[PDB]
Design a binder for this molecule. Structure first.
Ligand SMILES: Nc1ncnc2c1ncn2[C@@H]1O[C@H](COP(=O)(O)OP(=O)(O)NP(=O)(O)O)[C@@H](O)[C@H]1O
Ligand SMILES: Nc1ncnc2c1ncn2[C@@H]1O[C@H](COP(=O)(O)OP(=O)(O)NP(=O)(O)O)[C@@H](O)[C@H]1O
Ligand SMILES: [Zn+2]
Ligand SMILES: [Zn+2]
Ligand SMILES: [Zn+2]
Ligand SMILES: [Zn+2]
Ligand SMILES: [Zn+2]
Ligand SMILES: [Zn+2]
Lengths: 699, 699
């Protein structure tokens, strides 16, 4: 009844042991990069998945790949583990929302059972019609499926789009003309799938059937209603069953997977979730928590990595890691219920939970200086031809419920148009007329969690530009002048100073007969990426490799004398990356580390006062202290004369914003409008706004 | 706490429902082809595997394939399912017994922890030696692994055999010369792996370590001892950790998988096993049952398809299907504990359990007629250069414990030599000198469970030769003579009578854009495999397609007038295939059905009295009634003047044999000898023979 883990030394874990209770709601918390995500996914999920995959067939196990064995002594009390995260892929066009949620099969069964046959030539009711003289075969569930030759459209082989343009025959219905003739309640299968989830649930609720039809089709109706209710309680009440799976975002895919797992009813499975509440409005938090509790009540163990206060208060057991990040983290500081953590004096989460540390609402807010950005005729996706004014020089937050269209309206329209107008891009913008006020801006930079590189030749030091200064100060030493060296000698990108064996990468590729490529450190350079002649030069007792190896915190004291390097190192420390090292490969950096590197690079630049920054959910996977630091950094950037636009669902970040734009009042076809605009105080006075109500409650 | 299954209609299941208790020892029983194996594997295992695979990554799920959805209404209370069966594959040479059992990792850890360094050039002890002037790196567990560049032999990339001949450098050790220098207790890792499992366990038990060594290496020793004990209790105490996984047989692989599953300690997993006791001697039955109970006691549900009496008596819940096979089966006849089934008057298993029906020991036994088969210098595998005499004209059974070498000695030596001498084969026989008495035999036929064909053009009717008689009697009708037809017209292999659309196969291949090939019935012939002109001819109110469609039981009454067809149909009914149809495709036949078809074909032949039949475990997946029928058929074949040699572990079949040859007294290197020979009464008088003791107890 316990999951005993001993000798966990994965990544930065400091040889810790823990006993996680089974069949309970367990939440893991900690600072960003403190090792909680590693401790969960790389140890427990990896072991649970491997112990089940290895027992399967040899062909399937090899096809799925060989998961790396975690550095753990022994794990006791383990079950097969399923991980849900925002890591979806396009996969294939054959899969849609209905197929993933396993409701299309029930729809096919219902249409085969109580469907009403019809003639596609004469339009009358029917197994043959005396008017059109056409004979039809027996009704089977296989006919309504587009994955079989009996029902798939012959022109587009049941894909709905010739390889992409829509199929002219079925117009994307993915089914034969004869199959679509069968209609239930005046709507065929395609029309039912085209409806929204809530609309479909309402239609099924009030559907009228005869006594025989109700008697024969009851379990199917019950299952369909239960699955639709699960989907609604999850939060995706605006989606359509006919939507392709690839087009869904990470959060939508994760929530769909959660709903499918709830519907399946699997028992004795360890579920590991990575921030289920991300990309979700505050009003859906209670429903999400209820859904999580319902999933747990099926006989499953829940391991949720969430920093939400409501999730903390609704959990059974909380495990806190820290007290810092990187080399300062990897230890269990607090453990117990929420009350024990709140009373714990050495817990980072408890300090914010008890109210000792909190984000203070500013007493003064900036005002626009007559410069505005106007968007005219925004009609992309569900936008109802609205016009929005975005003030310049202030901190602007775009709020609204999920599916309101804020992410599309920002990313696919404003950022694309600004990039085309300023950076001379080659990407088609969204459906809009024109943008007024572009001349007030000079450049636009988008900050996200995408990796900063794909090769080991890119490092945070090189990205921030401090590597050039380091090379110059190394070449300015007495030894370099004596030996006639150049500033480019101390670089792993130009031949002459780097090691020729690994070409400056520091690693070598070894190919096995029946195994994938394995990367090992270079033997000639011992992973130092430099030859002996270059490494012979030392400045202040340290060489170039030693300088690259040390962390930002050590570099702060080491480079106190040089002001130009000191400024960049101080910026990197202020963006919260004091534990990282300058020589770390960009391929190993996480999303948060890459975002912090980009923020530090933007801060170090000489702002001209005509720069616009766009951030899409910057608080993904961030603790309360990380949120406070990010708010401070954003406020500093705004005070630097630039403009910041952030799409955020966190109330703490929202309450500190200067301008708020609300999109709603619902999601999907029910949204795309503008509800409230202005300062947070003004928005809090709007009655018909959920964000306004939550802001009024917070303030 | 229950597994509720409703509306199960897979294959021949007659829409049954059942409630299987959870976390209990459950045994499913029934006649061969009664639908128990289908009801278990195709429904429960398929659903449990699919509900876990679909939740995994898209790339892994598609790589592992898409399991077919069973025809079941709904299943409640399900967990991920693991199926263990004799369906292993060669896979890759990179996997051995130790790697599969997950003991090689612990061996590497132990050698890295308490290993004794040594010099491979001077032979002295050592991190460098002042004599050879050679420096060695730090000892790490990765060095002892052959799947990494640090330890793999460079000549053969860590495979142990260049692509096959052994690597001249490492001589199959799969490791570098420096790695093998580290020895624990006078033996390196390769020598430890080369030892038998029991010998290795004994060596580890009496291994002497210092106080510090014992303190630092205790968990590893405990895990190694536990895994070795599990392997011994399973029954494979003669295997070697260095043996390749591909060379293992089906039973050995299944038992290794069982031992690995026990060692892993997974919880909340439904385990489905297909005859775990097959290929195992009676003396290991108690140990196997104890191992199964220990595996269940970890919090798992056991679904065992076994016909053993001891398994029935050691189980918690028994579900019995029947009462017949094929169309007569697919229903739950009895359900409850062993006492309830024994008292049940309409249970097939209970009738044999209570003693109402039993196999009677013959009161007289046949004697050899001076004709014997002599094998001289049999040295293949573990045979210790023994000579065996096999009498001719009688029923001979080859017994012995697992690993004694009976299967090798028979199949790879005697059958191969007889085939080369008589049928003019091109397969190299085993290590033997010569065989005396070959001139007494005319031909040798081996009967196994391999499929009788790979195309739909082969059917049991064509295999037995009755199809030619059916074609002749169809062409002898008045209509065929009037239309000038030929005997070859009513055949799906020659153009002229068969349907040209499907070329007589009856199915068509349809290729999808992103899906594998799908086979559907031919539209032109409607699956009848004949054109309208041929089908127009009817004999006694039935056409050729109708004749092919009907079962053997109906054909018995239909073809009473024709004696030649009646004899073959009666033979097919007597071999227990009265439920099968003549037109069934050979690709869909199971192993038991194929074996019965081969037995019927052999029975229908005109025996010349100089034929030898070899059967390897013919009682695989057979009920008690099936065993009785097989014993009767074998006795009839022996009485037909031929010779039968059967390698069987079942005591019921053994007690009815005329001659018994015992190989032992142990398995592996401890066996390969001859213990007892003669009649079962004589064998039962041998004290140092487990088979003799069991025969004495039975008689
Ligand atoms: N490729 C697409 N095809 C059809 N409809 C789409 C597509 N992409 C988005 N939509 C819909 O158009 C709207 C886009 O809203 P979007 O801006 O993506 O969501 P949001 O309000 O920011 N919520 P969230 O992503 O959950 O944080 C939603 O109603 C989507 O369902
Ligand atoms: N390819 C191989 N390489 C090495 N040893 C082998 C190989 N095949 C078999 N052996 C060994 O040689 C002997 C062969 O015995 P075998 O006849 O296969 O077993 P058996 O006594 O019939 N038992 P079972 O198969 O369990 O019913 C055993 O000791 C095996 O471990
Ligand atoms: Zn009509
Ligand atoms: Zn189409
Ligand atoms: Zn190098
Ligand atoms: Zn030496
Ligand atoms: Zn080698
Ligand atoms: Zn045809």
């Amino acid at each position: 009844d316990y999951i005993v883990v001993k000798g966990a030394r994965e990544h930065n874990l400091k040889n810790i042991d823990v006993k996680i209770p089974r069949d309970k709601f367990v939440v893991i918390t900690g600072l960003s990069g403190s090792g909680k995500s590693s401790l969960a996914f790389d140890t427990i999920y990896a072991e649970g998945q491997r112990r089940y995959v290895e027992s399967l067939s040899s062909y399937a196990r090899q096809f799925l790949g060989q998961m790396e064995k975690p550095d753990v002594d022994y794990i006791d009390g383990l079950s097969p583990a399923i991980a849900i995260d925002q890591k979806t892929t396009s996969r294939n066009p054959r899969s849609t929302v209905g197929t993933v949620t396993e409701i299309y099969d029930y729809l096919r069964l219902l249409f085969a059972r109580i469907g009403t046959p019809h003639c596609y030539l004469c339009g009358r009711e029917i197994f043959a019609c005396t008017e059109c003289n056409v004979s039809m075969e027996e009704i089977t569930p296989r006919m309504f499926s587009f994955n079989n030759p009996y029902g798939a459209c012959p022109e587009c082989t049941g894909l709905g789009s010739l390889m992409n343009i829509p199929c002219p025959v079925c117009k994307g219905a993915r089914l034969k003309k004869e199959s679509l003739a069968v209609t239930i309640g005046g709507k065929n299968i395609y029309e039912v799938c085209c409806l929204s989830i809530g609309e479909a649930k309402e239609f099924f609720a009030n559907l009228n059937l005869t006594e025989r039809q109700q008697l024969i089709a009851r379990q199917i109706l019950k299952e369909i209603n239960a699955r639709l209710g699960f989907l609604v309680d999850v939060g995706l009440d605006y989606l359509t069953l006919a939507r392709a799976a690839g087009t869904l975002s990470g959060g939508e895919a994760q929530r769909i997977r959660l709903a499918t797992q709830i519907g399946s009813g699997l028992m004795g499975v360890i579920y590991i979730l990575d921030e289920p509440s991300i990309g979700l409005h505050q009003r859906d938090n209670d429903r999400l928590l209820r859904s999580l509790k319902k999933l747990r009540d099926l006989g499953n163990t829940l391991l949720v990595v969430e920093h939400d206060e409501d999730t903390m208060y609704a959990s059974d057991y909380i495990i806190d890691l820290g007290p810092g990040a990187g080399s300062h983290g990897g230890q269990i500081v607090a453990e117990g219920t929420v009350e024990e953590i709140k009373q714990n004096p050495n817990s980072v989460t408890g300090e914010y939970l008890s109210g000792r540390k909190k984000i203070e609402v500013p007493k003064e807010r900036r005002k626009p200086n007559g410069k505005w950005l106007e968007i005219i005729g925004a009609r992309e996706n569900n936008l109802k031809n609205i016009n929005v004014r975005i003030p310049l020089g202030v901190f602007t937050c775009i709020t609204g419920v999920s599916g309101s269209g804020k992410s599309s309206l920002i990313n696919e329209i404003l950022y694309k148009r600004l990039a085309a107008e300023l950076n001379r891009a080659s990407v088609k913008p969204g459906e809009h007329d024109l943008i007024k006020g572009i001349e007030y801006l000079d450049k636009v930079i988008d900050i996200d969690q995408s990796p900063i590189g794909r090769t080991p030749r890119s490092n945070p030091a090189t990205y921030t530009g401090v590597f050039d200064f380091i090379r110059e100060i190394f070449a300015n030493t007495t030894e370099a002048k004596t030996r006639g060296y150049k500033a480019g000698r101390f670089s792993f990108n130009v031949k002459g100073g780097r090691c020729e064996a690994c070409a400056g990468d520091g690693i070598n590729k070894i190919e096995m007969h029946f195994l994938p490529d394995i990367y090992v450190p270079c033997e000639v350079c011992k992973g130092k990426r430099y030859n002996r002649e270059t490494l012979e030069v030392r400045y202040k007792g340290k060489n170039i490799a030693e300088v690259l190896d040390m962390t930002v915190e050590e570099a702060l004291e080491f480079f106190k004398n040089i002001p130009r390097i000191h400024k960049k190192i101080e910026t990197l420390y202020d963006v919260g990356l004091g534990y990282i090292k300058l020589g770390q490969s960009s391929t190993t950096l996480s999303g948060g580390e890459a975002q912090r590197v980009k923020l530090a690079t933007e801060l170090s630049r000489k702002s001209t006062g005509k720069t616009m920054y766009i951030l899409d959910e910057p608080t993904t996977g961030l603790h309360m202290a990380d949120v406070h630091r990010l708010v401070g950094i954003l406020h500093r950037l705004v005070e630097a004369g630039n403009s910041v636009v952030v799409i955020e669902h966190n109330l703490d970040v929202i309450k500190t914003a200067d301008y708020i734009i609300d999109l709603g009042p619902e999601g999907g076809s029910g949204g795309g409008l503008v509800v409230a605009e202005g300062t947070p105080e003004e928005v809090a006075k709007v009655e018909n706004s959920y964000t306004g109500q939550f802001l009024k409650k917070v303030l």
